[PDB]
Structures are given as structure tokens and as C-alpha cells.
Amino acid sequence: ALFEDIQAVIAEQLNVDAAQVTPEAEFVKDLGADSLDVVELIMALEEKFGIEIPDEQAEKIVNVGDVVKYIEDN
């Protein structure tokens, strides 16, 4: 599933437990990331899923739902 997949990349990149990584969970406030962490995370995801995330979109991405709903919509 695309969720378990991305959730995996998120949990390993941000060194947190999978159970934390929920659609509602925020990269910064909830998962302890800093802005640069999300930049690295996004690049690893673009790599993994071979899809480009235009900057306008990347800056709109606040939670794990935002990132998932993008990848699968694209």
C-alpha cells in the first residue's frame, strides 16, 4: 500500500515510530522535524516514487496526509 510505504520512509528518515506517523501528524509540530528535515524527506520521496513535487506544492505540505495525497494524485 502507498500509505505503509511512505509512512515507512517518514518513520526511518525522521527517526520516529511508525505509530506516530499518522495522516493527521505534522512533520514539524508532531514528528519533531525541522524545515531542512522535510526538504531531505521530500527529496527521498521524489527519488523513491520518481515524481517531482513542484515547489508551490512542497511548501503547502504540512502533514503526512498532504504528502500521501499528493504522491497518489500524481
UniProtKB/Swiss-Prot annotation:
Pathway membership: Lipid metabolism; fatty acid biosynthesis
Subcellular location: Cytoplasm
Assigned keywords, A-Z: Cytoplasm, Fatty acid biosynthesis, Fatty acid metabolism, Lipid biosynthesis, Lipid metabolism, Phosphopantetheine, Phosphoprotein
Chief location bin: cytoplasm
InterPro entries: ACP, ACP-like_sf, PKS_PP-bd, PP-bd_ACP, Ppantetheine_attach_site
Molecular function terms, GO-annotated: acyl binding; acyl carrier activity; phosphopantetheine binding
A GO-annotated cellular component: cytosol
GO BP of this protein: lipid A biosynthetic process
Modified residues (O-(pantetheine 4'-phosphoryl)serine): 35
Family under the similarity heading: Belongs to the acyl carrier protein (ACP) family.
The protein, known as: Acyl carrier protein
Organism in which the protein naturally occurs: Helicobacter pylori (strain P12)
Lineage, opening ranks: Bacteria, Pseudomonadati, Campylobacterota, Epsilonproteobacteria, Campylobacterales
